[PDB]
RNA sequence: GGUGACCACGGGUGACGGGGAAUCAGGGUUCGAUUCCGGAGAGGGAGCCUGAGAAACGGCUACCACAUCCAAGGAAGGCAGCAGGCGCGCAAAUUACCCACUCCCGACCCGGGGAGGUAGUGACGAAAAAUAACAAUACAGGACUCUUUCGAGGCCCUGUAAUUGGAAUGAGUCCACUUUAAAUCCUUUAACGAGGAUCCAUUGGAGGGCAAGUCUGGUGCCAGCAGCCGCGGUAAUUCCAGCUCCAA
């Protein structure tokens, strides 16, 4: 906190997705790669925005510490953030939940519904007994 | 299928004949003088010079005023004076054939830090560089074979984190210090 | 194979798309359209590698679905639509307009243009023929066809075409001493003036073109596309003015630019 | 066959088993090159002998 | 002398490939009889089952017993004599074992004073003969 | 009639073609099963339906060869797809995770993709690069210097043994961050972490070719070594060991 500064570059606005894009480089002189949450809240203060719509990722620390380069995403509204953003970043910030099953079971369910024809009661009942 | 690259090349060539008393001593002179690990890296720089000599020789047989000879002529001369093995005023294709491997070896970071006086010996230099102590510009470098350019030659200095520039001494100093204060009131 | 191919390997993609080797194995594989896939830009690369508006394939999918991309006066939702040559890519929400023209090195370059200069488009007539009831038709370098053209337009000429109507506003005749642009081969992307058209019956014609600096080059007739009346180009030429410079002088141009900026 | 194969491993059986003496760990790598470079290049021997080899058994 | 005309390339190449059959290396590698006669069938190594333990007399200026083993290759079932190249590795060899036999050194030619032996044993019972000789690992007892 | 010593026809190929790979004065000689383009095939043949496009095989019909279930009345097959087994062999990886990337398909911003991506095994191979550095004592060495050998120090470099002797560090444990679809690894960065710094470099050699012992102890034309010359029959520069050197 004492010596951590945030710089931005390649900044450009695109209302195509109602966002402004930039690549940011942090300066943690003797500190670990600064956590994304601190960058989010500092980058929000630089741009005067609430620290729940700022999106940052792709943080690579240079050899020997100091500079770490990352990609910055900001939006004019959280509504738009839910609209056009990859789901992992929304899940990273907790606004999207992927409480699903593994892909291997989904394929087995699909094949097992292929064996049963038409009958909705058995088509929805194909995966009950073989749990 | 896969999106790999598999574009690789060897950086050295082994000698045709093994066990020459003349060649073995000549390479061992260079290895000891410049503090090299093995004979592969004296073969590597030799291979680098041979590639430069081959490229320079081809341009010389090429007719004068040929655009390729002119364009690539100053292209390889430009980078030869940038790294520093070639004199600024020695900008002729003939003078490239007169280059040796000693100049290509003294441009190494291990050699320059010794010559800059940062290191007490050429062999101290290798272990100092490998121990993440020296830096070029604002970047710490831990590779002895880092060739330096004329611009980067001045900037070579100790890294801030090392116990030679900024503070934060090594663990052995701290353990010695904590043992000293633990042995008395 | 047993049918049409619908894949394009990344290595096999056209060079002027300027794609790298590590992101993936496949290439946009542009859909069928007014331009051949070797000399077209799919919208995916134009909004990802040209303007960097989108980062990945699904990001350029969202922008096309929201319907701000408008090619040649029509909104196109196809992620891999073949843009082509001198087509107006108008994105009205951002207010920028692009005319797709090759740079000096035979590559399509970002050419921002004024809104009122986007209302028209040039086109090369390729085949002229008469249809049923004696109606003359005209097909251009695009897959666009019009009826009832001015009888003075012959093959491999240029027609001044305005958008949103499709009519012929004017036309450029193919003649000696006319400014043109090369659209294929080694001399692709070179702006120059016709000097000589030698013809070979049964084979391709060869034309000789001299640029502003005096350099003379030749190419096939199928790679000619007249974009000016004599000397004055009818479109805003891109940076470099369609002039070809050898390896000698872009190098000193960098050094001069670097030295000035240093 | 003559059946003379009963003598396989004869000498190696007869040889007395003397164990290797323990020795200081030998420097390896750049340091090993340092040692041999110092040994054979930066040294002056006043004794004669017509440049005897590195493994002289005098 | 040789022809030097401008359009004698056909004669030059036809004469070349006819004369290329007159050196042993080209004849050997392009006729196929040597490949068929090779017990290994063009392979660097071959596994086999120890059929017997035999001793071969050295040549005239030497006088020794070379401890070899008669081996049948698991592929093609051919019987060959493989030398055992150490001091006491024959004792490491018993009856009916898998042995990885390899060429002796010079491409199907007899080596040294051993007559008619062109193969040497490398591994036995899927453990290296060098490892057994140096005591690195012992027999699977 | 047509084709043939300008090599037809026939046979062989351990022949898929090409871009390309190895070697590298020049000229060439081998190699291209293998990620890009083209072709072919889906156990061997043959014949078809649908469709714009198939003689399709993760479509059908028949025969041949294998092979599964059966209540013996019948029924169902095609891993030269991803994994994974058997066999064959000198010889080649996990029955893992994900559609996050690249793209593909679909009615389609929303679904699917063993394509493909990620991780696991991986000394095929390629790049970088640890296994130590420094200082002060002893004893030699130096164009050393001081009286002109003798003795010392106003200097320099190696070497052997030492309570030296306190400085620097990673490889390891391990916090967090970062990376990522989620991880891992790398890079960051806490706390530990080096005096046989036992945190211990190996593989092959020492007659010549070819760098290195005319050392010591055994064996005695035996065992064995030896690519080739050759060594060994009792004083082995060549075998089996120790020691010491050599090469990478
Ligand atoms: Mg074949
Ligand atoms: Mg091939
Ligand atoms: Mg097929
Ligand atoms: Mg259809
Ligand atoms: Mg079929
Ligand atoms: Mg070690
Ligand atoms: Mg010995």
Swiss-Prot record, chain A:
It is found in: Cytoplasm; Nucleus, Nucleolus. It comes from the Eukaryota. Residues 100-118 have a biased composition (Basic residues). SUPFAM superfamilies: Ribosomal proteins S24e, L23 and L15e. The keyword Zinc-finger does not apply. Gene3D superfamilies: 3.30.70.3370. Mature tissues, such as adult brain, skeletal muscle, heart, and kidney, express low levels, whereas tissues and organs with significant populations of proliferating cells, such as fetal brain, placenta, bone marrow, and various glandular organs, contain significantly higher levels. It holds the Pfam family Ribosomal_S24e. It is linked to Diamond-Blackfan anemia 3: A form of Diamond-Blackfan anemia, a congenital non-regenerative hypoplastic anemia that usually presents early in infancy. Diamond-Blackfan anemia is characterized by a moderate to severe macrocytic anemia, erythroblastopenia, and an increased risk of developing leukemia. 30 to 40% of Diamond-Blackfan anemia patients present with short stature and congenital anomalies, the most frequent being craniofacial (Pierre-Robin syndrome and cleft palate), thumb and urogenital anomalies. This is Small ribosomal subunit protein eS24. It comes from Homo sapiens.
UniProtKB/Swiss-Prot annotation, chain B:
GO terms for cellular component: cytoplasm; cytosol; cytosolic ribosome; cytosolic small ribosomal subunit; extracellular exosome; focal adhesion; membrane; nucleolus. Pfam families: Ribosomal_S4, S4. The modification N6-acetyllysine is found at residues 65, 115, 154. There is a cross-link at residues 92, 138 (Glycyl lysine isopeptide (Lys-Gly) (interchain with G-Cter in SUMO2)). GO terms for molecular function: RNA binding; rRNA binding; structural constituent of ribosome; translation regulator activity. SMART domains: Ribosomal_S4 (SM01390), S4 (SM00363). It is found in: Cytoplasm; Nucleus, Nucleolus. Keywords: Acetylation, Cytoplasm, Isopeptide bond, Nucleus, Phosphoprotein, Ribonucleoprotein, Ribosomal protein, RNA-binding, rRNA-binding, Ubl conjugation. GO terms for biological process: cytoplasmic translation; positive regulation of cell population proliferation; ribosomal small subunit biogenesis; translation. Its main location: cytoplasm. Residues 107-181 form the S4 RNA-binding domain. Residues 161-185 are annotated as: Disordered. The modification Phosphoserine is found at residues 152, 162. NCBIfam families: PRK04051.1, uS4_arch. Component of the small ribosomal subunit. The ribosome is a large ribonucleoprotein complex responsible for the synthesis of proteins in the cell. Part of the small subunit (SSU) processome, first precursor of the small eukaryotic ribosomal subunit. During the assembly of the SSU processome in the nucleolus, many ribosome biogenesis factors, an RNA chaperone and ribosomal proteins associate with the nascent pre-rRNA and work in concert to generate RNA folding, modifications, rearrangements and cleavage as well as targeted degradation of pre-ribosomal RNA by the RNA exosome.
UniProtKB/Swiss-Prot annotation, chain D:
The modification N6-succinyllysine is found at residue 50. Residues 9-35 are annotated as: Disordered. Residues 22-35 have a biased composition (Basic residues). It is found in: Cytoplasm; Nucleus. Component of the 40S subunit of the ribosome. Contributes to the assembly and function of 40S ribosomal subunits. Component of the 40S subunit of the ribosome. This is Small ribosomal subunit protein eS30. The lineage of its organism: Eukaryota, Metazoa, Chordata, Craniata, Vertebrata. The gene is FAU. The chain holds residues 76 to 133 of 133 of the full protein.
From Swiss-Prot, chain E:
GO terms for biological process: cytoplasmic translation; maintenance of translational fidelity; ribosomal small subunit biogenesis; stress granule assembly; translation. Residues 1-19 have a biased composition (Basic residues). The modification N6-acetyllysine is found at residue 134. Pfam families: Ribosom_S12_S23 (PF00164). The modification 3-hydroxyproline is found at residue 61. PROSITE patterns: RIBOSOMAL_S12 (PS00055). It is linked to Brachycephaly, trichomegaly, and developmental delay: An autosomal dominant developmental disorder characterized by brachycephaly, ciliary trichomegaly, dysmorphic features of the face and hands, hearing loss, and developmental delay with short stature. Intellectual disability and autism spectrum disorder may be present in some patients. This is Small ribosomal subunit protein uS12. The lineage of its organism: Eukaryota, Metazoa, Chordata, Craniata, Vertebrata.
